[PDB]
Amino acid sequence: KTPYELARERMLRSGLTAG
Amino acid sequence: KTPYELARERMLRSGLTAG
Amino acid sequence: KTPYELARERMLRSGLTAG
Amino acid sequence: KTPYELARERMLRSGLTAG
Amino acid sequence: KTPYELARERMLRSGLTAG
Amino acid sequence: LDVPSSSRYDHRIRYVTYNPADVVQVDTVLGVATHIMLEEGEQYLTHAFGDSEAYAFARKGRHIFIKPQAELANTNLIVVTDRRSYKFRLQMRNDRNGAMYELAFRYPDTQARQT
Amino acid sequence: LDVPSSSRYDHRIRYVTYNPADVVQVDTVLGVATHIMLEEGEQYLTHAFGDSEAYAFARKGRHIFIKPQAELANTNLIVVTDRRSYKFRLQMRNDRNGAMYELAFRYPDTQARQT
Amino acid sequence: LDVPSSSRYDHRIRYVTYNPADVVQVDTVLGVATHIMLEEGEQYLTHAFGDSEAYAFARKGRHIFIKPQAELANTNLIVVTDRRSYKFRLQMRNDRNGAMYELAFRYPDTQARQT
Amino acid sequence: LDVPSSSRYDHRIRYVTYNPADVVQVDTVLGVATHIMLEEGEQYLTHAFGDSEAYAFARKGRHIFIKPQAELANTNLIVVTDRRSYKFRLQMRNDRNGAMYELAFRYPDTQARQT
């Protein structure tokens, strides 16, 4: 909920390259 | 119902060769 | 129900080769 | 339910090679 | 539920290579 | 009614001498396959069970496997070949003891032909 | 009924001398695959289980793996080849101890042929 | 039952001398892949798990990776090749300590052939 | 367990000397990709994660990027090539400090071959 948590979830979720 | 009766029904029912 | 009975049913049911 | 039982069911269930 | 348990389930679940 | 004779090592390996005018007694037990082997060069023609659903039959070449499929599987089996016909009285046992794993035939008719 | 003999290193590697008139005792345990290896140059023809659903069978060439699939998996196995037929009495154990990983055959019939 | 020996640098790299009459003890832990490497020029034929769903198997050439997939993953693995068969006793650990990353085999049978 | 050494400019560039009998410690942090570069002319064969879903793997040629995908991403990585196999102990950090951007290998085995 707090933007640090959403950022951390985004960092875990993303790949090395966008596609 | 009794297993003798089921055996007798099986003996009547079956053919000479399985197939 | 007892595992001896289920084993006996399995032994009657199965073929000589699995397939 | 107990993990020994689930392990035993897994051992019975599995084949010789995964596939 | 606790993140150690979810991590342990993930470790059991995953393969050697992603695909 | 000829009762096969056991080997000196194990009772599960049994022998019988073939007789065209006699029937071979085969004791079948739960969960045991019996291997009956025909004579070399003998060609299978047909078989007949007195009750097909009581036993399972599998053959490849001169090798025959039988196995009970049902309760009280008491029937007969006749296998006819080029040279002879075999008569088996299949009698299911109750105590799962004294099983027969293979039945081997000693043929004195071919021995008489050789004589 | 021949009981295979263990190696001096581990009890899971067992040896038996082949005898056409005897049956080989195989102790199977939960979650263990047993490797039975045939003689070199021997061709598989057929096998038969006294209970097919009790065990899993896999073969590639002269390598056979068996593995119990069910509770109380007590049956027999017969494998017939070009040169011989093997008789196994498969007896599932209860305590998951004394497993057999490989069974290797020593053939004195070929030794007698050499003699 | 042969226990592999660790290297002097890290305990995760272990060595064992091959023995056809013995079984190799492999300690597997949660979340760790073990690299078993076969001998050069050795051709994979078949493998068998005593419990396939307990472990993951991947092979490319002479490189084998295994990895537990389930709780209480205690089974055995047999890999048969052109030259030999490997016997592994796979025993899952509880504390995620003393992992094995690679197992390397020292073959004295080829050394005896050279001798 | 070899801990890579940092450069004199930035701690995010780290060096380690290759040892076939040792494991390389890799500290991974949140939101940071690590570039591991193989030796020139070295051909990738296979890799294995002790936990594939914990890390992301990308490779093009001799360039490997890894990146944690999950919480508590503590596993191992083995990359096998034509010439060697690399052993990495991947340990996720908590404070997002002391990241590793590249890991470069110094190979003394090729140096010994040159010697």
Residue numbers in the entry:
A (entry chain A), B (entry chain h), C (entry chain k), D (entry chain n), E (entry chain y): 135 to 153
F (entry chain i), G (entry chain l), H (entry chain o), I (entry chain z): 21 to 135
Paper excerpt:
All resolved OMCC structures consistently exhibit a conserved global organisation composed of an O-layer and I-layer sub-complex, often displaying a mismatched symmetry between them. For instance, the OMCC of R388 has a C14/C16 mismatch between the O- and I-layer, respectively. Intriguingly, O- and I-layers are formed of the same proteins: to only mention R388, the O-layer is formed of the CTD of both TrwF/virB9 and TrwE/VirB10, while the I-layer is formed of the NTD of these same proteins. The conservation of this mismatch symmetry across various T4SS types emphasises its importance. This distinct pattern observed in the OMCC, characterised by a quasi-symmetrical mismatch, suggests the existence of a specific maturation process during OMCC assembly, although the exact mechanism remains enigmatic. We would like to suggest a plausible role for this asymmetry: to expand the dimensions of the I-layer structure, thereby achieving the ideal diameter to accommodate the growing pilus at a later stage.
